[PDB]
Amino acid sequence: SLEDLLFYTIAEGQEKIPVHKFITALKSTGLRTSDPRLKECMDMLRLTLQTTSDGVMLDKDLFKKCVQSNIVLLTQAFRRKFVIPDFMSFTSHIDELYESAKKQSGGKVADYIPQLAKFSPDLWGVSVCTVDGQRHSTGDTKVPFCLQSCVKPLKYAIAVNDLGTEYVHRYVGKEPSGLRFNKLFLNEDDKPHNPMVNAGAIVVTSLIKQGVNNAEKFDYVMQFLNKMAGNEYVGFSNATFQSERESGDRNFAIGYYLKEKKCFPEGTDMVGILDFYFQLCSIEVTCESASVMAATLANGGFCPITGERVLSPEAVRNTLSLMHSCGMYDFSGQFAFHVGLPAKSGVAGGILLVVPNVMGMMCWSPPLDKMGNSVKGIHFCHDLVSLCNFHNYDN
Amino acid sequence: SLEDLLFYTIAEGQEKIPVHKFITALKSTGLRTSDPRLKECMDMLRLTLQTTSDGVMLDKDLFKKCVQSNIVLLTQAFRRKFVIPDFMSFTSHIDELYESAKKQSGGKVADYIPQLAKFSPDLWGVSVCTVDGQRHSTGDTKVPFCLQSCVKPLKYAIAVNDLGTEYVHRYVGKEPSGLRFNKLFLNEDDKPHNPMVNAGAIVVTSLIKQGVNNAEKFDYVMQFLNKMAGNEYVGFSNATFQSERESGDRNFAIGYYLKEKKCFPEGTDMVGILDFYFQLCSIEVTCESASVMAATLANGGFCPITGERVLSPEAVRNTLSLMHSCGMYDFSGQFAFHVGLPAKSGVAGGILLVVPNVMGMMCWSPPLDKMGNSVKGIHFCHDLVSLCNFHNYDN
Amino acid sequence: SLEDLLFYTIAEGQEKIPVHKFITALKSTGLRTSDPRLKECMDMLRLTLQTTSDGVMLDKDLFKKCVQSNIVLLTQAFRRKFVIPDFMSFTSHIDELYESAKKQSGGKVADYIPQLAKFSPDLWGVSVCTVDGQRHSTGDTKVPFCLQSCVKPLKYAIAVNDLGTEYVHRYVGKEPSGLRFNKLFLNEDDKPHNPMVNAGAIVVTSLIKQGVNNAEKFDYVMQFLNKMAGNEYVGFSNATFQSERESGDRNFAIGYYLKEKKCFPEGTDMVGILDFYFQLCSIEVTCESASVMAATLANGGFCPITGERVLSPEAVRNTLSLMHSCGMYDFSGQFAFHVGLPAKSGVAGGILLVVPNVMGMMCWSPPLDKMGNSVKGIHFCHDLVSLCNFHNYDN
Amino acid sequence: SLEDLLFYTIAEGQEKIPVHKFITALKSTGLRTSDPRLKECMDMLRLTLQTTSDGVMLDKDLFKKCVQSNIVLLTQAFRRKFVIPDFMSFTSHIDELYESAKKQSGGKVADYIPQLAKFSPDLWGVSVCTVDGQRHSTGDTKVPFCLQSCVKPLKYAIAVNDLGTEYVHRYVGKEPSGLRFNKLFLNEDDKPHNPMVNAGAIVVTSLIKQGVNNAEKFDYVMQFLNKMAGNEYVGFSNATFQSERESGDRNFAIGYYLKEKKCFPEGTDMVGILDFYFQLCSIEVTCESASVMAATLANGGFCPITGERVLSPEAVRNTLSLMHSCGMYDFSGQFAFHVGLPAKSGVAGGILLVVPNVMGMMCWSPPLDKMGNSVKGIHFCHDLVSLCNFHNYDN
């Protein structure tokens, strides 16, 4: 049977296979023992460990009993039918790129609020989540940090998922602005140029769950992020929020400018919307959870490690299309010339990368360049395409 | 004696001069019986009327007794040594220009707040106050209306009077912006282009009576306006204030923009300053009092009908210099090409005109042209220069 | 004819009656030449003065022509059929009481805001407006001052006039509280004890012109006050308003208390209502206009000097009933024991008195007693009843 | 040697002791393998497991090497010299009391905000942290929930720790109020009766880290809580915060009342302080971390599982003294009559208990009784004293 073939493949001309050998073989592919899809499996393994004092042998029966539950994924995992047959080489390349970027230093940790100018200019982490569940991480990849501007794609997606592309873009433009993210001007039809600049993001935040109050708005967005991350860490930084809602004079200017030109739906409280905008900017993540969010965007709108649909196909398509042409603001043209991938960056360090149909990725380093991007993150993104051929127009 | 010469001049080969004849002769020149400088005089006249049942004759003694108090002004008034020897012809020209402008119609009363779109498109008033006390008025020249933007010169003057030109312009520019009054941009050194656009006016309002609260600020400004108007009507429109503080999204945007670029003194509440700005815009006047304010600006900084110094010579000079090049915003170049006078206008109707060393003038008409100026006011200003040769560069 | 009888009554065995004699005879009764009901009359008199150089005689024709317009009031005025046949004696008593109260001194001008602690402790004015137009004033009776708490009756009346007693008292109680005006507690059914304490007044202010914004609310109330005052001075003190909205911590506490116990109609902004409450407290009056307002309350809800209905009979009845039992707060029982009249008082000085079916009265003196009432006002009210028998239960 | 004696005690007439036997023996006492004080120890054990494929024997050398680091605690733990020699019986009693309280049902989950009326009326957890590190938990003891009112003691302690008892009580009273927690009245010297009612808590929150902004205030308090909890879970509920800052009309009333009676230090923003108060109420904990906080209070102000001093002895003494007489508000007298322990309760469920010199405890159950306390929590507290003799006045 297929289970017998798998057992023989794991074994080497022997009779019994220990549990630890099976676990190591599973983890070598790239899957994590904590994968939700494997939950039942591991549970049974624990039930097997509850009997023996130390170590247990699975010859025919217990292995089949444990592997019987949802026997689809394991066959592909051990038949090397994923999107990256050898993840242990791509992980080595990720490590080499990480080391190469670590030598690069010299920047300026953001200091417009005290919660950003408290990270040492040495934290540096990279996390990759493949579209088929393979995950790898290297560096400070569990220190919480605020998404800041990395949430703006995640916002826009959600709106189009709940309302639709037609209705949503009845409010925001679709074309690169050509100027800085915080510039106070609108497109030809007095609309934000796109939902990636601050004006369009402020507009988009007002199309989400209209009518209900900010508690319900925040709860709805948090639930969406939780199942988009695959039930990974999504939190809130109240100290960052309290600093940000006090130093947001430019965003207040933008909000009033938008309110004067009638850029909001009917029946919208603009100052409350702006507070809700700061709150969504103050959501904490780790490289692990943000990599899973990017993988969700890259895959189909389905979660990679739960197989759950979170966004419409149209939402993901619209999200990647706008990220490619507006993700780095007036640097996107030059970021697309050398990387050619959908990407977003926040002033707290952090590059969110989508390799569509391959993976999502998060690269966090607090120190910034003059453009507002982490130096190591930009270096890593530049080198990854030159060493792995991910540019969209490569052959 | 000089009093005897004046009495003979008033009389025509007779013995006694009745009081009414003297009053008519005085009013023919242009002075008003309610002139503060003549106060004592009129009081004595009343003391003379308290005795006789009807009519009284002044031959030698009573005339000298009444005229003795402050006998300087009367000699100049009856010797035709004022700045306009015959005011009864300039008044006729003012009436002709008023009639000519009345025939002109077709505009749009301001309707962005309900307190402006309640004046019939037929109110039309003109008031002139000469630098030497002569006053004339024609039309609806006692209906209250908000100064709105006509206060911005009066603001700036006051600041330079209390602080100084150097300190004041350490905060605002000195050059025409080239764009609209409410555009959200600053000069080369991130400063308002001038104190006539909304940004520079918002900055100037924060240099006045710093430290104290808005009650004391408002009281100080009101006192300054009261002695600048010569103790004429200066009031407040609370309904207009309540409407304006609710529809001021553009000014809120400008204020937050200025707060982000550090365009205020140290220790300034910007939202409180903005409320104080709306309040100063909500001060009511009549053509009579605003004409006296303009006469004060035109004269020396001294009041015309009280002989009291209200502003420094530097304040008046700086005020007229900035009004000429910025009074009509991006229309000033064309307003200075055909009128060549310091002028200011508000969306509530109302043109404040200074003819330096000659007079001040107020022309109120609610209906506006597309530029934002009263049609009849602009017509009157254009025709006054073409019929009286007031252009600064005329010969 | 009746006109001939009046002419003979004015004359004393003569042929012609001069205009000044007629004016003096009219003013001796108590009516003012500026009475709106007499407007046309005076106009014709001016038309008569435009011809003769000085003085004019009315024998038969011109007198009839001038008196023909609205010949009802004059017959009653000269037949001594008013409510006070000899007003020249009640005026003498008012003057004696004024002089008696002036000798009394020693108090404490309110100093919780700077706009109240700026009046010298010597201003002292009294104004009386009879239900039939007779008016008398003595002292500083044209200096503006804020009504403050004297508006609370005027508020409540208006609500019941527009909504009805049943609906209005569905929200506020009807019984004396027994405690201070600013105590933070409610009646048995979690309602304000009455609309004279601050809680009930805050509730009443929210029943007026619901739905519209504060500009329209303020305009509506101002119009109501203007025709209630008979087109006398009703203004706004922006400096007092700005001080009062900053030192109103007790009223903010009361408003939040009321908001938590659900003491407002549905769809009410409590902080906006509180601002509107401060604004209505910041309306300026003079003894002249407030006396006319009190006369309107006393008469029928009709204006005394315009013959215009301003409030429903139910509104006036309910207003006087609540003023009698709650006008002085926990002093009313003792104020009704010695005066027995509807009265209200404000911390800016000012006693508003109603003698129902007789007159209205305003007595202004800034210095306060420990209870919060002007010393001279309380003295005048005590002495007026002891010298003129106005107590409601007198025989 | 002492290590040899310990090894013999662990062993039973054998040569070698396996690691798992030692771990089980250690955990039987009550200590947790994750104890920070044992950190180094466990690390070495891992270094021992890295060599052998499965299982390892420690005869003389490795046991001494692992136990050498900080060999003080183990001797007391295995000599039964802790404060509870047999924790496995107190844990059994805790389980019996938990089961007894679970059978009790019938209450009303708080529903004044939606974040409280979302917990099923079946969550029920109890956690005990002994003063010497022993810990036990039963039930849903890791579900986050807001402290709400359980933070008020933790607040007050901190203030007295940083400023001092004399200074702190210069602002708040020291005596039971006799009325409800949210009553709007003050003591004889216009001061909050104590820092356990809402007024005194609002005052106390304004004495903490004065001058700095709410970001720094929140960070300081969070750090204090983190080392008071022993580096256990301390978080924030932004949704609860956003709901609570919108439904806090009573607390706004109390704050304005306190601001009017001058109950704050000089230079305090009361609305900002109130927001900071809501934020501190919105801190999430679990029964595990709150039990450790209570143990810190009970012990000496030293942490139980880190041996670190967090508060002054005066702070802990003052905290327990005020909790005993004010912890349950106007129920304390009856709570002290049957329990006689320092305790605090919040409307989110949750009883914080201190058994001074013995332990701290947290008992969470959302459904409330009419008094505002969790039914199962009150039942557990009543039964614990009747079955274990913890009442302060027992013999």
Author numbering:
A (entry chain D), B (entry chain B), C (entry chain C), D (entry chain A): 138 to 532
How do the authors describe this structure?
Glutaminase catalyzes the first step of glutamine metabolism, converting glutamine to glutamate, which enters the tricarboxylic acid cycle. In human, glutaminase is encoded by two different genes, GLS1 and GLS2.1 GLS1 can be alternatively spliced into kidney glutaminase A (KGA) and highly active glutaminase isoform C (GAC)1. Glutaminase, especially the GAC isoform, is highly overexpressed in various cancers for the utilization of glutamine. GAC can be further activated by anions. It has been observed that GAC can form active filaments both in vitro and in vivo.
